[PDB]
């Protein structure tokens, strides 16, 4: 995007990532890297060791801190100090975090300059409209019994894999797929992502996925009609451009964070067809009723409410019964799943061998 | 009695040494034994008789690894011949290379 | 060509020496089509 | 003793391995290759008597 | 010549005074190159290539 929008020649632009670490030899140039590639102190590669000296030796003129909501974290702020720059800028959609370090940005890069409304841009055609919803899926009795006795650490996995969520997701996916909508399913738990993906036979991406494979998956999901839905995880929570994505679903969450909810929603806010008449994006949040998810759900969506988004409670999904088949529809499958999830917790002697 | 051996290979290599040959050059079984034991640091276990014995013999056994090799049994004796030949040629018991003999003169 | 050029006549040819002869999620083995470029 | 073939013998002579296995014939006997006429005829005769 | 002055090894070879030993040095280096190298890396840095008289 950098090259597309400006007239900078590719020769003067250098990329500093894990694949390639070469640095520009020009008098003036641009370096695009990640904080983890510059905040490391103990150990660095020989190729990276020269790059670290290359960054430190020169006196830069401007530093752009993309996603500046993580610069006040433990150590990414070191790049701001180690890297010499006469001006510092911060870019983040959500200027909030659980701790009080958010205020540290004032003396790190300066105060907040400008802010923009969300609903104002929605009505002006700049961004798409979202029909936010929250589905309350009552956990089945058999699983709920283990929920009471089980410890907090294991409790999370129990109500995230309840059979009701599987059936609701299948009906929504089929209904939305029939409508020609691109669906993204977020899940912080890797095990749930794999189980959902393999059960539904859909691609999934998470931490272990390599850069090459995921890039091919993302390109296929954008332009390939056969692949209309994917299964992303916390890795794709933010900073990945999906101009084609329109629908968004989430099954798991990272407790009470109010930024992840907004960051995840951003995947469908840059949809290409955000100006055609009557278009409204969808954001479904599957939460198990009568569980701690409501405490986190009501606490992790407070930021979006302030912006202007309103979540709609959906107690019933019409037409769910008429669907031909649903996962874990019989008690036998539910019992099998219950135990499955529960069980989760001398150089010449060289010829000898 | 004075003293791993469970997996020691049943095959044995026996070397007989001449006292008249070993007293021409001042050597003891201690230095030659450790020289063999240090050539292969701990691969093979060896025992040497004392000088007081009527005949000087060193018994050597190669210990197989934890994994059992069935294909090596056919060449097990062949491997012993291989090490036996090397143990005679490329072993520098003591001295400097390329020095075949030395004579004292006045 | 060099001799003709020395004479000043246009050489309708050139010396031939100047002719410069110039994986995770493996449950979708074959569904993925390679959309590498656009 | 079920001699080998010219192609097999030539391959073994070449540097396919440091030395021929001591029990190469035994290993190939189990596989069924490199049999004898007596064994070759007996199995065929038995294959007919069975029907 | 297959190898020009842009190569550090050649610079040493071209510095030999006597023709006989100098000739031997050049042959040992040039005989192993199987391409004219119309473009050769610049001596200042290996990033950009400096054009050299060649045919490829
Ligand atoms: Mg961004
Ligand atoms: Zn040439």
Short description:
The structure is cut from a larger assembly and holds 1 copy of chain A (353 residues), 2 copies of chain B, 1 copy of chain C (38 residues) and 1 copy of chain D (51 residues). Chain A is of the alpha/beta class and 353 residues long.
Set down the secondary structure blueprint.
This is part of a larger assembly, with one copy of chain A (353 residues), two copies of chain B, one copy of chain C (38 residues) and one copy of chain D (51 residues).
Chain B: E1 13-17, H1 19-24, H2 29-39, E2 44-48, E3 56-62, H3 76-89
Chain C: H1 2-7
Chain D: H1 6-13, H2 24-31, H3 37-49
Residues 66, 239 of chain A line the site of magnesium ion.
Organism (chain D): Saccharomyces cerevisiae (strain ATCC 204508 / S288c) (Baker's yeast)
Protein name (chain D): Transcription initiation factor IIF subunit alpha
Family (chain D): Belongs to the TFIIF alpha subunit family.
Describe the structure.
Chain A: A motif (DEAH box) lies at residues 66-69. Chain A: Residues 1-113 form the Helicase ATP-binding domain. Chain A: It is found in: Nucleus. Chain A: Residues 167-321 form the Helicase C-terminal domain. Chain A: One of its GO terms (molecular function) is ATP binding. This is part of a larger assembly, with one copy of chain A (353 residues), two copies of chain B, one copy of chain C (38 residues) and one copy of chain D (51 residues). Chain A has helices at 2-5, 36-39, 46-57, 77-82, 105-108, 119-123, 141-149, 152-160, 163-178, 190-200, 211-223, 258-265, 293-300, 302-307, 331-342, and strands spanning 13-15, 30-32, 63-66, 88-91, 130-138, 183-186, 229-232, 247-250, 281-289, 312-314. Chain A is an alpha/beta fold. Chain A has a six-stranded parallel β-sheet, with helices on both faces. Chain A has a two-stranded parallel sheet with strand order 1-2. By secondary structure, chain B is an alpha+beta fold. Chain B has a single domain (1-94), classed as Gyrase A, domain 2, CATH 3.30.1360. Chain B is globular, with a radius of gyration of 16 Å. In chain D, 0% of the residues are buried. Chains in contact: A-B, A-C, B-D, C-E. Zinc ion (ZN) is lined by residues 36, 54-55 of chain E.
Proportion of β residues of chain A?
5-15%
Looking at the structure, what is the overall shape of chain A? Answer: globular
| Rg of chain B, nearest Å | 16 Å
Sequence of secondary-structure elements of chain B: EHHEEH
By CATH reckoning, the class of chain B would read Alpha Beta
By secondary-structure content and strand pairing, the structural class of chain B works out as alpha+beta
> Greatest interface and its residue counts?
A-C, 19 and 12 residues
User: Termini separation of chain A (Å)?
Assistant: 55 Å
**Helical fraction of chain B:** 25-40%
**Cross-sheet strand order for the largest sheet of chain A:** 7-6-8-9-5-10
Fraction in beta strands of chain B: 15-25%
Q: Classify the oligomer.
A: part of a larger assembly
Instruction: Please summarize the sheet with the most strands of chain B.
Output: 3 strands, antiparallel
H/I helix tally of chain A: 15
Instruction: Give me the Rg of chain A, rounded.
Output: 24 Å
Number of separate strands of chain B = 3
Strand order of the largest sheet of chain B: 1-3-2
Number of strands of chain A: 10
DSSP helical segment count of chain B: 3
């Amino acid at each position: 995007q950098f090259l597309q929008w400006c007239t900078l020649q590719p020769e003067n632009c250098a990329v500093f990532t894990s694949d390639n670490k070469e640095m520009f030899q020009t008098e003036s140039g641009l370096v695009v890297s990640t904080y983890s590639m510059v905040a490391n102190t103990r150990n660095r590669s020989h190729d990276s060791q020269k790059v670290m000296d290359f960054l430190t030796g020169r006196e830069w003129g401007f530093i752009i801190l993309d996603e500046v909501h993580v610069v006040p974290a433990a150590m990414f702020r070191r790049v701001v100090s180690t890297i010499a720059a006469h001006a510092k800028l911060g870019l983040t959609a959500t200027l909030v975090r659980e701790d009080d370090k958010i205020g540290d940005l004032n003396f790190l890069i300066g105060p907040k300059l400008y802010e923009a409304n969300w609903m104002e841009l929605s009505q002006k055609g700049h961004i798409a409209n979202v029909q936010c919803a929250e589905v309350w899926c009552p956990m089945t009795a058999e699983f709920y019994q283990e929920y009471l006795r089980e410890t907090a650490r294991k409790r999370m996995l129990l109500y995230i894999m309840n059979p009701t969520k599987f059936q609701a997701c299948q009906f929504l996916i089929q209904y939305h797929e029939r409508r020609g909508d691109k669906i993204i399913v977020f899940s912080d738990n890797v095990y749930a992502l794999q189980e959902y993906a393999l059960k539904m036979g859909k691609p999934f991406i998470y931490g272990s996925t390599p850069q090459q494979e995921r890039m091919n998956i993302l390109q296929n999901f954008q332009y390939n009609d056969q692949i209309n839905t994917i299964f992303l995880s916390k890795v794709g929570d933010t900073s990945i451009d999906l101009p084609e994505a329109t629908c968004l679903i989430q099954i798991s969450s990272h407790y009470g964070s109010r930024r992840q909810e907004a960051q995840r929603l951003g995947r469908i806010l840059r949809a290409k067809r955000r100006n055609d008449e009557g278009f409204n994006a969808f954001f479904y949040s599957l939460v198990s009723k009568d569980t701690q998810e409501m405490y986190y759900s009501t606490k992790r969506q407070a930021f979006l409410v302030d912006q202007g988004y309103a979540f709609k409670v959906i107690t019933h999904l019409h037409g769910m019964e008429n669907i031909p088949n649903l996962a874990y529809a019989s008690p036998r499958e539910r019992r099998e799943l219950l135990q499955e999830v529960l069980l989760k917790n001398h150089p010449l002697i060289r010829k000898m061998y | 009695s004075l003293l791993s051996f469970d997996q020691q290979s049943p095959w044995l290599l026996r070397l007989e040494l001449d006292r008249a040959a070993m007293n021409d050059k001042d050597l003891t079984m201690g230095q030659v034994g450790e020289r063999i034991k240090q050539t292969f640091k701990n691969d093979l276990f060896v025992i040497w008789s004392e000088d007081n014995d009527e005949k000087l013999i060193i018994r050597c056994r190669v210990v197989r690894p934890k994994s059992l090799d069935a294909e090596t049994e056919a060449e097990e004796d062949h491997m012993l011949k291989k090490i036996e030949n090397t143990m005679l040629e490329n072993i520098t018991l003591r001295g400097v290379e390329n020095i075949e003999r030395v004579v004292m003169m006045k | 060509p060099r001799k003709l050029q020395d004479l000043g006549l246009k050489p309708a040819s050139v010396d031939p020496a100047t002719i410069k002869r110039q994986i995770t999620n493996t449950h979708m083995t074959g569904i993925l089509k390679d959309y590498s470029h656009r | 003793y079920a001699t080998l073939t010219i192609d097999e013998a030539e391959k073994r002579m070449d540097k396919k391995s440091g030395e021929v296995p001591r029990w190469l014939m035994k290993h190939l006997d189990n596989i069924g290759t490199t049999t004898t006429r007596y064994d070759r005829t007996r199995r065929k005769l038995k294959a007919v008597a069975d029907q | 010549l297959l190898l020009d002055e842009h190569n550090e090894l050649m610079r040493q070879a071209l510095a030999i005074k006597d023709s006989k030993k100098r000739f031997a040095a050049i042959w040992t280096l040039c005989k192993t190159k199987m391409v004219c190298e119309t473009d050769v890396p610049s001596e200042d840095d290996p990033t950009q290539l400096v054009s050299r008289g060649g045919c490829g």
